[PDB]
Design a protein around this ligand. Structure first.
Ligand code: HEM
Ligand code: HEM
Ligand SMILES: [Zn+2]
Ligand SMILES: [Zn+2]
Ligand SMILES: [Zn+2]
Lengths: 106, 106
């Protein structure tokens, strides 16, 4: 998947998490988000097309996913434990990260 | 990249880290390692080449990388602060997460 498709995946699954009945659905949705975030980390977003691979901006971008994958992983543990609404709230607070990178780079 | 190439990148940077001259270099290598761990996440190891991508084995396999990227992440911050030494000792203990996975799965 390219970046836009990976982002849609992060989007489709946050939606699923909000409305899931049970832990297993939340946990799965979260696995799917982890994979997409991971697959997207190597992308070059259109706004940063003209900076070098090793530029502070590109490194910042990559670090944005390291945060995101970190919180996703944590949300995965809560859901894996059976804690549905804590997991759903962990998915909601992830949005800070989505937003802080869209402000800079989308 | 394929899994061999990613593991090569992991091993390689650890040796760049073991003998780095400044914090910048430790940070750069740790970052390269995070990206190679990100990319490897979705590989299927030869040990599980017959297993479904959603088997319990493959799940536990992907967890190993989630854990490893977390620890790389924290090591990256010690590097970034400029605590070169502590970062070098941090990277050395990552080998636990390397061997732990290798022993189950390589
Ligand atoms: C789970 C949290 C996130 C959600 C729900 C999300 C959602 C989205 C959506 C819906 C789009 C529109 C793309 C399309 O039309 O298919 C998009 C674009 C984009 N996102 Fe995210 N995102 C998240 C996290 C992030 C993070 C952490 C970063 C950066 C580190 C990021 C970087 C970008 C960029 C650069 C674009 C523009 C892509 C392009 O035009 O090629 N996103 N995102
Ligand atoms: C910094 C930590 C790690 C280092 C330095 C490392 C290094 C290596 C090396 C040198 C190899 C031999 C393959 C080659 O010749 O390149 C290898 C293979 C392998 N590693 Fe790692 N590894 C690390 C962590 C992990 C983790 C966390 C996992 C799984 C969660 C993993 C899974 C595997 C597998 C499945 C192979 C066999 C692939 C093959 O050679 O066909 N490794 N790794
Ligand atoms: Zn892809
Ligand atoms: Zn960080
Ligand atoms: Zn974990």
């Amino acid at each position: 998947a390219d970046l836009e498709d990976n982002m849609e995946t992060l989007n489709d699954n946050l939606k699923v998490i909000e409305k899931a009945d049970n832990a297993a659905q939340v946990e799965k949705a979260l696995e799917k988000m982890l994979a997409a975030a991971a697959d997207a980390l190597k992308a070059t977003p259109p706004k940063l097309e003209d900076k070098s691979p090793d530029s502070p901006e590109m490194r910042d971008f990559r670090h944005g996913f390291a945060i995101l994958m970190g919180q996703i992983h944590d949300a995965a543990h809560l859901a894996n434990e059976g804690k549905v609404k804590e997991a759903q709230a962990a998915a909601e607070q992830l949005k800070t990260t989505c937003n802080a990178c869209h402000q800079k780079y989308r």
